[PDB]
């Protein structure tokens with residue numbers, strides 16, 4: 001079930017989100033708020049079609065894609081840049097390459113049991129996040 005990323009995932013850890021945001025040139029006042037925020041990931045996955053929402057108390061980031069289909073991603077509410085994005089499977093890891101102004105920009109997202117791992121990369125900065133599958137009703 002390592003390819004099934006469906007559901008709601010609640011952030012457990014967030015390492016070096018500051019460096020990732022700084023590499024994206026996000027302004028200092030925004031980073032000061034954003035580094036503290038818990039995030040939630042909501043994934044609606046139907047085969048290779050993904051609809052994703054990353055939410056917080058401050059701002060949300062939405063991106064939808066089909067595995068294997070390059071798309072024009074506009075990173076609204078993050079750094080507000082246009083990139084050419086492609087998501088593919090490398091094994092059971094979902095890998096996105098975002099070609100554009102910033103070198104070495106992309107992300108890798110994968111399941112281990114009840115945990116979702118996400119590594120966000122830009123240039124020489126890597127942010128490593130872990131989310132836990134939302135607790136089901138009592």
Ligand SMILES: CCCCCCCCCCCC(=O)OC(CO)CO
Nearest residue numbers: 034052054056059060061063078109
């Ligand atoms: C500056 C305010 C930040 C507000 C929180 C929003 C942060 C989003 C970070 C990028 C997440 C991302 O691209 O993740 C992909 C894989 O999960 C989306 O499919």
